[PDB]
């Protein structure tokens, strides 16, 4: 077939890298295509990702990495049976999209608390900036965004409506995009 | 590129390693810092990466390095994990696919890592002078 949109990937810098592409004409990604990916390092092993569709002409693949560092590079080969359709490379550290914070709950003051999505030893852990979004459930447009630093994943607000809150995060030092929003919670 | 993320990551790991000794950090590795004749900084980084590589490859599965408790087991596990990080970042920094080691001198892994830390400390000081 033909690949209309070359695979573009993003990495959570922990254990998953997601790539997506577009071929011309309907395609069943999971049965027709195989994205092989391998760390460009003497000690490495060729891995096979089995794609899934994101539309009739689109494919998505989730690459699994055991650990990832700055210098790491991956060779990506999109095969269809025995025909190499595209061959390229992907550097996780330059396409970091962080994992989303979770466990967001609400407890004078109002206290919001959530989990850093990375373990202590991940290079991202201490580089995270959180953005907490609050808005009156009962008709938004009236919202606030509070930036919180990496250190403590909580937010004490003082400031009869019911509000909803969500939190996302990014890592400036790694020049990342924003993570997806955490599930949102609410209080009166 | 001075203090790029690759250098920042090496320093972070060097700081996290030194925060946990394992019974096996006493095993000996080749001392490529003896730097007898003249080699460039990249050859050093490359050789260091290569010496670290020989170590986790042979001792990652070494029962003698695991101790007796869960805390010591995870310490060996963490140690092996950080040495791989050190190796790949130093190897990428050197930008070399070949750096044959001929040095005879041996060194304890702890002293080796200590000496690498001094070198990374001087490098680091080069981009925030």
Curated annotation (Swiss-Prot), chain A:
Reported impact of residue 39 to A: 100-fold reduction in IL4 binding
Substitution effect: residue 42 to A: No effect on IL4 binding
Mutation effect (residue 69 to A): 35-fold reduction in IL4 binding
Site annotation Major IL4 binding determinant: residues: 13, 72, 174
Compartments in which it is found: Cell membrane
Residue ranges annotated for the Fibronectin type-III domain, each copy included: 100-188
Glycan-carrying positions: 28, 73, 103, 147, 175
Topological domains annotated Extracellular: 1-188
Effect of residue 13 to A: 700-fold reduction in IL4 binding
Disulphides: 9-19, 49-61
Maturation and modification: On IL4 binding, phosphorylated on C-terminal tyrosine residues. The soluble form (sIL4R/IL4BP) can also be produced by proteolytic cleavage at the cell surface (shedding) by a metalloproteinase.
UniProt effect for mutating residue 174 to F: 200-fold reduction in IL4 binding
Tissue specificity statement from the Swiss-Prot or TrEMBL entry: Isoform 1 and isoform 2 are highly expressed in activated T-cells.
Effect caused by changing residue 66 to A: Little effect on IL4 binding
UniProt site positions, description: Minor IL4 binding determinant: 39, 41, 67, 69, 123
Effect of residue 123 to F: No effect on IL4 binding
Motif stretch (WSXWS motif): 178-182
Binding partners and assembly: The functional IL4 receptor is formed by initial binding of IL4 to IL4R. Subsequent recruitment to the complex of the common gamma chain, in immune cells, creates a type I receptor and, in non-immune cells, of IL13RA1 forms a type II receptor. IL4R can also interact with the IL13/IL13RA1 complex to form a similar type II receptor. Interacts with PIK3C3. Interacts with the SH2-containing phosphatases, PTPN6/SHIP1, PTPN11/SHIP2 and INPP5D/SHIP. Interacts with JAK1 through a Box 1-containing region; inhibited by SOCS5. Interacts with SOCS5; inhibits IL4 signaling. Interacts with JAK3.
Domain comment as written in the entry: The extracellular domain represents the IL4 binding protein (IL4BP).
Entry function: Receptor for both interleukin 4 and interleukin 13. Couples to the JAK1/2/3-STAT6 pathway. The IL4 response is involved in promoting Th2 differentiation. The IL4/IL13 responses are involved in regulating IgE production and, chemokine and mucus production at sites of allergic inflammation. In certain cell types, can signal through activation of insulin receptor substrates, IRS1/IRS2.
Family: Belongs to the type I cytokine receptor family. Type 4 subfamily.
Name recorded for this polypeptide: Interleukin-4 receptor subunit alpha
Species this protein is from: Homo sapiens
Gene that encodes the chain: IL4R
Curated annotation (Swiss-Prot), chain B:
Role summary: Cytokine secreted primarily by mast cells, T-cells, eosinophils, and basophils that plays a role in regulating antibody production, hematopoiesis and inflammation, and the development of effector T-cell responses. Induces the expression of class II MHC molecules on resting B-cells. Enhances both secretion and cell surface expression of IgE and IgG1. Also regulates the expression of the low affinity Fc receptor for IgE (CD23) on both lymphocytes and monocytes. Positively regulates IL31RA expression in macrophages.
UniProt superkingdom: Eukaryota
Main location class: secreted
GO cellular component, one term: extracellular region
Keyword Chloroplast applies: no
Protein name per its UniProtKB record: Interleukin-4
Documented effect of changing residue 9 to A: About 500-fold lower interaction with IL4R than WT
Subcellular location: Secreted
GO biological process, one term: positive regulation of MHC class II biosynthetic process
Glycan-modified residues: 38
Gene assigned in the entry: IL4
């Amino acid at each position: 077939f033909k690949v209309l949109q070359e695979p573009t990937c993003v990495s959570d810098y922990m254990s998953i890298s997601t790539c997506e592409w577009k071929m011309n004409g309907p395609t069943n990604c999971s049965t027709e295509l195989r994205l092989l990916y391998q760390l460009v390092f003497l000690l490495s092993e060729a891995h096979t990702c089995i794609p899934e569709n994101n539309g009739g002409a689109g494919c998505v693949c989730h690459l699994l990495m055991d650990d990832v560092v700055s210098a790491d590079n991956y060779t990506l080969d999109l095969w269809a049976g025995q025909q190499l359709l595209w061959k390229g490379s992907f550097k996780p550290s330059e396409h970091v999209k962080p994992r989303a914070p979770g466990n967001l709950t609400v407890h004078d003051t109002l206290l919001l608390t959530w989990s850093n999505p990375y373990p202590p030893d991940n290079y991202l852990y201490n580089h995270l900036t959180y953005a907490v979004n609050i808005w009156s459930e009962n008709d938004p447009a009236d919202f606030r965004i509070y930036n919180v630093t990496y250190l403590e994943p909580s937010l004490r607000i003082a400031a009869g409506i019911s509000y909803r809150a969500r939190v996302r995060a990014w890592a400036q030092a790694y020049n990342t995009t924003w993570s997806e929003w955490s599930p949102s919670t609410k209080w009166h | 590129h001075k203090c790029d993320i690759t250098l920042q990551e090496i320093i972070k790991t060097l700081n996290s390693l030194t925060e946990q000794k394992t019974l096996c950090t006493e095993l000996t590795v080749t001392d490529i810092f003896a730097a007898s004749k003249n080699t460039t900084e990249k050859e050093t980084f490359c050789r260091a990466a290569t010496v670290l590589r020989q170590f986790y490859s042979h001792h990652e599965k070494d029962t003698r390095c695991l101790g007796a408790t869960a805390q010591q087991f995870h310490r060996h596990k963490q140690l092996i994990r950080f040495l791989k990080r050190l190796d790949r970042n130093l190897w990428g920094l050197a930008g070399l696919n070949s750096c044959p080691v001929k040095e005879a001198n041996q060194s304890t892994l702890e002293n080796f890592l200590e000496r690498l830390k001094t070198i990374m400390r001087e490098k680091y000081s080069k981009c925030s002078s």
